[PDB]
Amino acid sequence: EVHLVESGGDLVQPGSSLKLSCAASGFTFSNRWLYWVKQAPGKGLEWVGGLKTKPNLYATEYADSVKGRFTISRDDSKNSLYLQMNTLRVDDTALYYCTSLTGMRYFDYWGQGTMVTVSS
Amino acid sequence: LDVLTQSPSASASLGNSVKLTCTLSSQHSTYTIGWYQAGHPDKAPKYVMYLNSDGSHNKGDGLPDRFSGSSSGAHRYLSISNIQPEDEADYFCGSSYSSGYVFGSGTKVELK
Amino acid sequence: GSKDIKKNKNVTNRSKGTAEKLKPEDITQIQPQQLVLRLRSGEPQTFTLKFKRAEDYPIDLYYLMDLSYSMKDDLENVKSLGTDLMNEMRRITSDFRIGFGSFVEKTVMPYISTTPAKLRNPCTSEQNCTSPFSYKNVLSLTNKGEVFNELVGKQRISGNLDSPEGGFDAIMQVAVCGSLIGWRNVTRLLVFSTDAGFHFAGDGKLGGIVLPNDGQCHLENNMYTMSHYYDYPSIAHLVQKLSENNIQTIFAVTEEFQPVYKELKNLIPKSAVGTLSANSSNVIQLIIDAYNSLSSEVILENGKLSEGVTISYKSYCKNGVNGTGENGRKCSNISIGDEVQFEISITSNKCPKKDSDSFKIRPLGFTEEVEVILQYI
Amino acid sequence: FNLDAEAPAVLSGPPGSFFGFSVEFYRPGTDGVSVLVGAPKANTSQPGVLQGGAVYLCPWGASPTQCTPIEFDSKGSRLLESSLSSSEGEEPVEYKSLQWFGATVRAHGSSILACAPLYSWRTEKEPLSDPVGTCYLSTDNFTRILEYAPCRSDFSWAAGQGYCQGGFSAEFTKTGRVVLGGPGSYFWQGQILSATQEQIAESYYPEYLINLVQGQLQTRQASSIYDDSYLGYSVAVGEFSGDDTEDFVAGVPKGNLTYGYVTILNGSDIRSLYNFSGEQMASYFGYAVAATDVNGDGLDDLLVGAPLLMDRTPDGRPQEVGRVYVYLQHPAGIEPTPTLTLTGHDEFGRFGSSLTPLGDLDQDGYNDVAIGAPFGGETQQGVVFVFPGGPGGLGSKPSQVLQPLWAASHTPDFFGSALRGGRDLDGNGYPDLIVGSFGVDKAVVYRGRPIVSASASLTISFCLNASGKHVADSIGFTVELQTLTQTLLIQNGAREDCREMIALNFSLDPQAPVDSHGLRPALHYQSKSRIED
Numbered sequence A: 001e002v003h004l005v006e007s008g009g010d011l012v013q014p015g016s017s018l019k020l021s022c023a024a025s026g027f028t029f030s031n032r033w034l035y036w037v038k039q040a041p042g043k044g045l046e047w048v049g050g051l052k053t054k055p056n057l058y059a060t061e062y063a064d065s066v067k068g069r070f071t072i073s074r075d076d077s078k079n080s081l082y083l084q085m086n087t088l089r090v091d092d093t094a095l096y097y098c099t100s101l102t103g104m105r106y107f108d109y110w111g112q113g114t115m116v117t118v119s120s
Numbered sequence B: 001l002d003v004l005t006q007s008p009s010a011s012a013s014l015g016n017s018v019k020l021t022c023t024l025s026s027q028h029s030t031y032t033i034g035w036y037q038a039g040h041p042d043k044a045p046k047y048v049m050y051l052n053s054d055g056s057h058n059k060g061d062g063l064p065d066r067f068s069g070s071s072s073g074a075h076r077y078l079s080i081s082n083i084q085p086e087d088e089a090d091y092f093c094g095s096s097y098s099s100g101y102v103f104g105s106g107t108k109v110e111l112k
Numbered sequence C: 001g002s003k004d005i006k007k008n009k010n011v012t013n014r015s016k017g018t019a020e021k022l023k024p025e026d027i028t029q030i031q032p033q034q035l036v037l038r039l040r041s042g043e044p045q046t047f048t049l050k051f052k053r054a055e056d057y058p059i060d061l062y063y064l065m066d067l068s069y070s071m072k073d074d075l076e077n078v079k080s081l082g083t084d085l086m087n088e089m090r091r092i093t094s095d096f097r098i099g100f101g102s103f104v105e106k107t108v109m110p111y112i113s114t115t116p117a118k119l120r121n122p123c124t125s126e127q128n129c130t131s132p133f134s135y136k137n138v139l140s141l142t143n144k145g146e147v148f149n150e151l152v153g154k155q156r157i158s159g160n161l162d163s164p165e166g167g168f169d170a171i172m173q174v175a176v177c178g179s180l181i182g183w184r185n186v187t188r189l190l191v192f193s194t195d196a197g198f199h200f201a202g203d204g205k206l207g208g209i210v211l212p213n214d215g216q217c218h219l220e221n222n223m224y225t226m227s228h229y230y231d232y233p234s235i236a237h238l239v240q241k242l243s244e245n246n247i248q249t250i251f252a253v254t255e256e257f258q259p260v261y262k263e264l265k266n267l268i269p270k271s272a273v274g275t276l277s278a279n280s281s282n283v284i285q286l287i288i289d290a291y292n293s294l295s296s297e298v299i300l301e302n303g304k305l306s307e308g309v310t311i312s313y314k315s316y317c318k319n320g321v322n323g324t325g326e327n328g329r330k331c332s333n334i335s336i337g338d339e340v341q342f343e344i345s346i347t348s349n350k351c352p353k354k355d356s357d358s359f360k361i362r363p364l365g366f367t368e369e370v371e372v373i374l375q376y377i
Numbered sequence D: 001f002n003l004d005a006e007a008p009a010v011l012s013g014p015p016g017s018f019f020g021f022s023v024e025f026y027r028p029g030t031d032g033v034s035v036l037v038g039a040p041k042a043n044t045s046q047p048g049v050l051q052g053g054a055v056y057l058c059p060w061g062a063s064p065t066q067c068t069p070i071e072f073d074s075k076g077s078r079l080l081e082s083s084l085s086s087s088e089g090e091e092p093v094e095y096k097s098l099q100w101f102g103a104t105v106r107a108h109g110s111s112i113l114a115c116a117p118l119y120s121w122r123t124e125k126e127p128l129s130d131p132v133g134t135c136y137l138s139t140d141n142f143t144r145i146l147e148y149a150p151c152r153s154d155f156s157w158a159a160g161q162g163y164c165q166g167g168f169s170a171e172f173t174k175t176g177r178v179v180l181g182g183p184g185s186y187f188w189q190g191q192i193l194s195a196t197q198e199q200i201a202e203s204y205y206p207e208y209l210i211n212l213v214q215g216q217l218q219t220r221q222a223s224s225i226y227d228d229s230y231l232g233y234s235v236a237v238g239e240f241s242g243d244d245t246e247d248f249v250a251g252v253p254k255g256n257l258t259y260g261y262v263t264i265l266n267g268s269d270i271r272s273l274y275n276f277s278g279e280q281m282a283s284y285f286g287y288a289v290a291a292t293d294v295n296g297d298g299l300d301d302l303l304v305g306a307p308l309l310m311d312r313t314p315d316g317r318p319q320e321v322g323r324v325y326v327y328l329q330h331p332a333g334i335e336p337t338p339t340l341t342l343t344g345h346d347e348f349g350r351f352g353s354s355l356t357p358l359g360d361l362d363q364d365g366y367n368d369v370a371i372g373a374p375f376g377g378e379t380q381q382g383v384v385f386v387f388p389g390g391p392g393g394l395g396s397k398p399s400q401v402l403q404p405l406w407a408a409s410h411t412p413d414f415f416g417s418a419l420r421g422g423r424d425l426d427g428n429g430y431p432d433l434i435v436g437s438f439g440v441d442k443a444v445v446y447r448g449r450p451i452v453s454a455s456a457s458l459t460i461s462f463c464l465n466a467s468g469k470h471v472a473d474s475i476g477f478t479v480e481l482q483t484l485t486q487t488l489l490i491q492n493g494a495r496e497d498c499r500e501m502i503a504l505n506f507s508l509d510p511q512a513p514v515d516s517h518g519l520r521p522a523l524h525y526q527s528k529s530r531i532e533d
């Protein structure tokens, strides 16, 4: 129960663009803020960005490593979250995890992230 | 912005205790943090606990009660009481702030 | 100035035997019952009264008990006071009567857990507590000691949320309910038995209760109704109502709470404190030691003086010990059949619009008085 | 003296609502200026909520002084997600019925904080009835309204924060930081609990009832020997540390073996700086607290109320006659013992249930103070006493006594149970005062009159010279020589005015014209109204 499932991980050249998708199930997706967290292939976690719900005007947040390059979007009718990635660097190689904040600002649920392999 | 400082490694004999530390920025010494356990082979992180400035904590739904937390000014601690083989992991500190989230560099816990 | 002693009926002789035991109205302990004083400008006028502790003045005892769960083993030991205390008091007086009532707390949202489960049983599910109540008058004062054992032996313990308990609006009802409690014109003893601190006025504000206690009887079917409507009394309102209704309080309280009740004793006049055993197993000797402390001291009250009038006291006691000022109201070590003297000085600073007024000087804990009538020259 | 007591403006709310339980000034300034009044027991247009409480906006300058309720909240009680998902049927998570909303009202600039200290909830895990607090914070003139419920947490029963009653007391600091008291945390130890309006706004996550205000200050839990203390029964703010950031005064009326104490907590941290302790056991020391500079030394002086205090009469009878304790701040610190004490004269009157600064009411150079006695006066309706500022601290005897103009009734009025002063409603340049009187469902507004300073002399001729702060250009005087009697207009900017032809005696003319605001001037103290040769 309470699953998150990432899709769209692939091997791509630098300077390209890629679309990552996440599907939620077993909880009311329109009542949680959802978030992206990367982990490069031998390194600690890094927060990528996130996206609030309708009462918070669907406001969206991004790390300075990611601002202007990536964009996050939501479809509460599809229980689904998206990351659009543009002008990819070799630094963008990671597992990308999809996750949810609680009111006490901890990540309660995590998916099992898609590998992105930005390489020539 | 918020900086979270962790030591790269900690260790104890099977059945002894371990204490991890995460230190907040001095501007942010009263902030509440989450603890994650995440070292299990290529698996996603797991929420362990959240921990307040005053030392108050709340554990995740499945956590073995060996885990407990405490605070001292800017420092935050995770204590594991009697290390099992299943406690061998990376542990990540993490803090929400006005415009995002930040994670500590992680601590590996090792049996010896 | 001049004075005239009008009544002057003598204090009792030491009683000769059982052949004609006196009524509590026939026993006399204070010497001049009425006198008239002619006051003249700034001239001080002095008179003297004698006091003599009577041999066998009757007792009424009301036992007021905290029935929160920690008093469960206390209640199991308290079942037998209605014969054991009747026996140990039979050397103390010919006439003794006993009564019982019980308290917990105000039945409103901060002081009680208000879920449907905790309204039915205030305790953990293995503890069979009855639902909470503010006060019960279980047994109005009686000489039938086995009726105390019967009714007290069939009470059931209750429970509560916050540590200090709602005992002060149970003390107020015991003082002001008079003929419902059954009090005579005798020595009125109230035993207040508990293992916690007291709620007092201003604690009602957390429950949205803002009307002060009016200090009037609100019993229906022996239950205190309206505990949800009036705040707890202040100590200053209990000081008034206990003193006005002749009630002498024994705080029979556990070893932990001695330092609060030892100061409540300093505020509430003619009251005493004992160290209660965890299971109230020492109750009979606690009450008797406290009664000997309450009974062997006199304090002189007076009614309100009119404008520009002044009063002062000197006291002469056993073994040559004396006192003056506000300590001149007191006297101590008064043994059974023993005698005491006071000298009292009235003074004026004015000539009031009326030629006279009068006021009573009286021992706290008794209905006996001297009336002083003032004539202004 | 200076407050217009013969015809104050009276506001009235619904019968049996407790209108006037808490009062305040809103937008004090040249425009938009209004009175806010709380009504804890009022009915409300919320689905299924009984006596939820209300707050009323009462705009100033409208001659009938009408009042309209503000919808901070407009929803019913929320429902348990499991229950609305279940064949067993729906149940509430919340108990908004009888919550006492509007029992505390505060404002700072365009922001308003209104609190419901008898709110309670079922914790979403297990059946509980926990009286946590709630407040609603309005920002930018009702542009946004935010629920702030800082004790509503995963620490949910009487042993944690479950009985906290946050917003039982509240303040705003000079920068606009929200400060709350909750007397019930950790088995009634109590708590102080503070956040900025920017943190309260950044925290907003309305789908979560347990939520984090990241960076919030709060006082820790202590050992069980501190239980039943009631910290935060009352709060006030002033600068006491010697830094730029105001420090929280808080009342602990049951602390210290029931003697009671008051604590000053520092701003920036929340650590304790000074402690003062009550004179007598179960005198309610810390029922009220206030901080203002009453001697004009530049430093905030502390005031504390103990409404239940006893003394005994010169006769020897005891009486309940409350006491107010004053502690001047020196540049070296605050003394641990009172520099002055004021005591009431009516038995059960409860002098010191209410304290407010008045600002400088009479523009004398020194801040005055109003003190309430909710059961004082010859028929126990209640009283308010104005005590003057001066170089030694407050005067020991009041410069004015305010009392109800309406007759007594079947239940108490509680007049003077709530006070707010030291802002200016009509804009005449003198402070004004609001008095609450919730037992009759009323609030009363008293206005500072303009003050004239005057002088005259005999010169056998006689001369007159008068002037005053914010007074009109021509001042109406009337004069008697002892006979000859005259009425004169003396210009406020003049050096002197004089007449050719014993004693000379003068007054402001009683029938002179009423000023632009609707008031008449008061003649100042001293000022020698009679001269004799």
Ligand SMILES: *[C@@H]1O[C@H](CO)[C@@H](O[C@@H]2O[C@H](CO)[C@@H](O[C@@H]3O[C@H](CO[C@H]4O[C@H](CO[C@H]5O[C@H](CO)[C@@H](O)[C@H](O)[C@@H]5O)[C@@H](O)[C@H](O[C@H]5O[C@H](CO)[C@@H](O)[C@H](O)[C@@H]5O)[C@@H]4O)[C@@H](O)[C@H](O[C@H]4O[C@H](CO)[C@@H](O)[C@H](O)[C@@H]4O)[C@@H]3O)[C@H](O)[C@H]2NC(C)=O)[C@H](O)[C@H]1NC(C)=O
Residues within 6 Å of the ligand: B054, B055, B056, B069, B070, B071, B072, B073, D221, D222, D223, D224, D226, D255, D263, D272, D273, D274, D275
């Ligand atoms: C104005 O008046 C008030 C009183 O009215 C006065 O305040 C009291 O002041 C005293 C003295 O400062 C306080 O008592 C001290 O409290 C200290 C804190 O106690 C709590 O925290 C302790 C430390 O653990 C927490 O904090 C550390 C931070 O470093 C953190 O790592 C931990 O994870 C944790 O978060 C803790 O040990 C302590 O434990 C007690 O309470 C818990 C319940 O919370 C209980 O389970 C324990 O059994 C125990 O009773 C508590 O949790 C404390 O550190 C300090 O310790 C001293 O005394 C002990 C002996 O008693 C010594 O062994 C030790 O070496 C220290 O000397 C001490 O107990 C008291 O709490 C205040 N009361 C309040 C706030 O209500 C103000 O100071 C006055 N202001 C003035 C005078 O200006």
Ligand SMILES: *[C@@H]1O[C@H](CO)[C@@H](O[C@@H]2O[C@H](CO)[C@@H](O[C@@H]3O[C@H](CO)[C@@H](O)[C@H](O[C@H]4O[C@H](CO)[C@@H](O)[C@H](O)[C@@H]4O)[C@@H]3O)[C@H](O)[C@H]2NC(C)=O)[C@H](O)[C@H]1NC(C)=O
Residues within 6 Å of the ligand: D032, D057, D058, D059, D068, D141, D142
């Ligand atoms: C800050 O917020 C407060 C609260 O909303 C606000 O006070 C209110 O302002 C409105 C708008 O001026 C007032 O509404 C008026 O109500 C009276 C009757 O009580 C009407 O007669 C007024 O009619 C005028 O405005 C109408 C607008 O539809 C016109 O159609 C009409 O022809 C008139 O021009 C008007 O509706 C309301 O009474 C006050 N409430 C109180 C109690 O003050 C305040 O104005 C805001 N301040 C800002 C925005 O800075």
Ligand SMILES: *[C@@H]1O[C@H](CO)[C@@H](O[C@@H]2O[C@H](CO)[C@@H](O[C@@H]3O[C@H](CO)[C@@H](O)[C@H](O)[C@@H]3O)[C@H](O)[C@H]2NC(C)=O)[C@H](O)[C@H]1NC(C)=O
Residues within 6 Å of the ligand: C077, C277, C279, C281
């Ligand atoms: C109420 O409290 C009192 C005092 O705490 C209890 O008194 C105690 O009674 C017990 C009996 O259960 C006594 O124990 C016995 O002592 C003898 C002699 O030492 C020993 O041979 C027995 O094996 C037994 O242990 C005990 O001495 C006595 N005193 C205390 C303080 O323990 C009393 O039992 C409690 N209950 C009631 C209903 O009174």
Ligand SMILES: *[C@@H]1O[C@H](CO)[C@@H](O[C@@H]2O[C@H](CO)[C@@H](O[C@@H]3O[C@H](CO)[C@@H](O)[C@H](O)[C@@H]3O)[C@H](O)[C@H]2NC(C)=O)[C@H](O)[C@H]1NC(C)=O
Residues within 6 Å of the ligand: C315, C316, C317, C320, C321, C322
């Ligand atoms: C305290 O007050 C009492 C009462 O006023 C004082 O008693 C007085 O004691 C003196 C000395 O004994 C008495 O004078 C003599 O008394 C004996 C009998 O005690 C008598 O035989 C002598 O002829 C002579 O009267 C005095 O009368 C007595 N007064 C009274 C009214 O009892 C006592 O001295 C005072 N002590 C203190 C504390 O100063």
Ligand SMILES: *[C@@H]1O[C@H](CO)[C@@H](O[C@@H]2O[C@H](CO)[C@@H](O[C@@H]3O[C@H](CO)[C@@H](O)[C@H](O)[C@@H]3O)[C@H](O)[C@H]2NC(C)=O)[C@H](O)[C@H]1NC(C)=O
Residues within 6 Å of the ligand: D014, D015, D016, D017, D041, D042, D043, D051
């Ligand atoms: C909020 O609304 C409630 C409910 O309408 C009001 O309570 C109601 O108060 C009235 C008038 O006193 C009650 O009616 C009276 O009943 C008594 C007998 O109980 C009778 O003697 C009178 O003839 C009379 O009609 C009524 O029962 C009561 N209803 C409820 C549901 O409590 C309340 O006054 C309102 N409060 C505010 C602040 O407006």
Ligand SMILES: *[C@@H]1O[C@H](CO)[C@@H](O[C@@H]2O[C@H](CO)[C@@H](O[C@@H]3O[C@H](CO)[C@@H](O)[C@H](O)[C@@H]3O)[C@H](O)[C@H]2NC(C)=O)[C@H](O)[C@H]1NC(C)=O
Residues within 6 Å of the ligand: D241, D242, D243, D266, D267, D268, D269, D273
């Ligand atoms: C009320 O709380 C404030 C904030 O904690 C107190 O001011 C604080 O005072 C300490 C000690 O002076 C300051 O520590 C500083 O450390 C830096 C180096 O990191 C040093 O250069 C400074 O000279 C000082 O030692 C702390 O920064 C300062 N915090 C603030 C916000 O100013 C204040 O002392 C407390 N109230 C009082 C006066 O007791």
Ligand SMILES: *[C@@H]1O[C@H](CO)[C@@H](O[C@@H]2O[C@H](CO)[C@@H](O)[C@H](O)[C@H]2NC(C)=O)[C@H](O)[C@H]1NC(C)=O
Residues within 6 Å of the ligand: C127, C128, C156
């Ligand atoms: C708690 O005590 C009460 C009172 O004894 C119990 O209720 C009584 O139960 C007995 C035996 O079933 C009946 O004969 C009485 O008529 C009942 N009286 C009442 C109070 O209704 C109750 O059953 C007990 N509960 C527990 C937890 O044992």
Ligand SMILES: *[C@@H]1O[C@H](CO)[C@@H](O[C@@H]2O[C@H](CO)[C@@H](O)[C@H](O)[C@H]2NC(C)=O)[C@H](O)[C@H]1NC(C)=O
Residues within 6 Å of the ligand: C183, C184, C185, C367
């Ligand atoms: C106890 O004493 C009081 C006071 O003397 C008695 O109350 C008075 O009783 C008489 C006769 O009924 C009345 O005329 C007075 O008006 C009463 N005064 C008071 C104080 O109310 C009371 O009757 C006596 N009771 C007993 C048991 O003797």
Ligand SMILES: *[C@@H]1O[C@H](CO)[C@@H](O[C@@H]2O[C@H](CO)[C@@H](O)[C@H](O)[C@H]2NC(C)=O)[C@H](O)[C@H]1NC(C)=O
Residues within 6 Å of the ligand: D256, D257, D259, D260, D261, D275, D276, D277, D278, D279, D280
């Ligand atoms: C709590 O209150 C008691 C009583 O006022 C305080 O004890 C007093 O201490 C002061 C200063 O030493 C003395 O002047 C008083 O005479 C003492 N009174 C009593 C009754 O002993 C006690 O210090 C207070 N504790 C706190 C909170 O400071």
Ligand SMILES: *[C@@H]1O[C@H](CO)[C@@H](O[C@@H]2O[C@H](CO)[C@@H](O)[C@H](O)[C@H]2NC(C)=O)[C@H](O)[C@H]1NC(C)=O
Residues within 6 Å of the ligand: D478, D479, D480, D505, D506, D507
């Ligand atoms: C100047 O003095 C006279 C004498 O006091 C005042 O006239 C009386 O004032 C008193 C008090 O206001 C009134 O009760 C009398 O009715 C007045 N009439 C007299 C003469 O007895 C007069 O008001 C004073 N006026 C000025 C200008 O100061």
Ligand SMILES: *[C@@H]1O[C@H](CO)[C@@H](O)[C@H](O)[C@H]1NC(C)=O
Residues within 6 Å of the ligand: C318, C319, C332, C333
């Ligand atoms: C009473 O008098 C006796 C001597 O007869 C003395 O031992 C005892 O202490 C006195 N009691 C007091 C002080 O009341």
Ligand SMILES: [Ca+2]
Residues within 6 Å of the ligand: C068, C069, C070, C163, C195, C196
């Ligand atoms: Ca108890």
Ligand SMILES: [Ca+2]
Residues within 6 Å of the ligand: C070, C071, C072, C073, C074, C278, C279
């Ligand atoms: Ca017991």
Ligand SMILES: [Ca+2]
Residues within 6 Å of the ligand: C104, C105, C111, C160, C161, C162, C163, C164, C165, C166
């Ligand atoms: Ca209780």
Ligand SMILES: [Ca+2]
Residues within 6 Å of the ligand: D238, D239, D240, D241, D242, D243, D244, D245, D246, D247, D266, D267
């Ligand atoms: Ca400061």
Ligand SMILES: [Ca+2]
Residues within 6 Å of the ligand: D292, D293, D294, D295, D296, D297, D298, D299, D300, D301, D328, D329
């Ligand atoms: Ca000052």
